[PDB]
């Protein structure tokens, strides 16, 4: 899963992440979806792999605008990378973080500076972390609600925490942003959208995925 060379320093990992082209970040995401398609499909029920690429492009857009060196927050809210993978995704981080032992199909990397700051590990771990919350959601939700409430867990820690406005502005927006890439033939190029971009169709945004 590691992208940059083993032993690369924090500041080099960050500089190199900031230099990745949109196309390069899309390729990292696609590789991880390819590797982990069976568990992604099993949990989320996405139609096919292409729409799963688009969903995770939607997450990259919503969380970082594809700026892979984005870093935010403190403690449980401290996140890095294109998907804003928080410390809580990682094994052997703070012992008070809620455990994520419900995704045996994906390696859970330990919390280390390489594993948190390397783009490859960060993307793998963000997918794993999302699946952790989507599986919490699947206990009570079906169809689009698995990914919709799984996203709310990803961002807030709680699948049912959020008010409708934030479900719309975070989860529905993620779905809409991801679909932009598929609908406009931007699955491999350097083009990107962004939260609230008026180019994006954000009406019935879950449609393409199922
Ligand atoms: O009560 C049960 C236990 O709770 C533990 O605290 C939880 C807390 O309740 C959750 O809200 C918090 O959730 C994190 C979540 O894990 C992260 O994925 C998320 O990451 C965000 C990321 C992606 O959107 O980007 C940010 O927005 C950038 O800032 C991140 O915020 O952040 C959520 C909010 O912090 O997780 C903690 C830890 O599991 C207590 O620690 C326990 O003592 C308690 O038993
Ligand atoms: O809270 C969830 C998540 O948020 C992440 O931060 C997001 C912001 O939520 C989101 O609003 C923000 O969107 C910006 C984007 O950064 C800009 O690049 C983009 O700029 C547009 C501009 O609005 C247009 O006028 C111009 O023509 O084009 C540019 C694009 O080239 O504007 C949007 C909307 O304001 O993106 C943030 C991510 O980059 C946090 O990072 C994350 O931690 C949170 O979990
Ligand atoms: Mn992987």
Author numbering: 141 to 350
Question: What text comes from the article?
Answer:
RtGH124 is the defining member of CAZY family GH124. Unusually for R. thermocellum, RtGH124A is not targeted to the multi-enzyme cellulosome complex of the organism but instead consists of a ‘dockerin’ domain which instead targets the enzyme to the cell surface of the bacterium, followed by a CAZY GH124 catalytic domain; RtGh124 is therefore an unusual enzyme if its primary role is in cellulose degradation yet it is not part of the cellulose complex. Metal binding also occurs with a stoichiometry of approximately 0.5 (in solution by ITC and in the crystal through occupancy refinement) and we are thus unable to deconvolute whether the 2-oxohistidine is required for metal binding or antithetical to it.
In passing, we determined a series of structures of GH124 co-crystallized with cellohexaose which revealed the unusual binding of a contaminant, a terminally fructosylated cellooligosaccharide, with unambiguous density at ∼1 Å resolution. Clear electron density indicated that the reducing-end sugar was not glucose, as expected, but a 1–4-linked fructose moiety. The hexasaccharide appears not to be cleaved, as four to six molecules of each chain have been observed in all of the structures (data not shown). Our initial thought was that the fructosylated oligosaccharide would be likely to represent a very minor contaminant in the G6 preparation, one somehow selected by the enzyme owing to tighter binding and/or inhibitory potential. Manganese is coordinated by Asp141, Gln172, Glu175, His176, His264 and a water molecule. High-resolution structures of RtGH124 (1.40–0.94 Å) have revealed an unambiguous modification of C2 of His264.
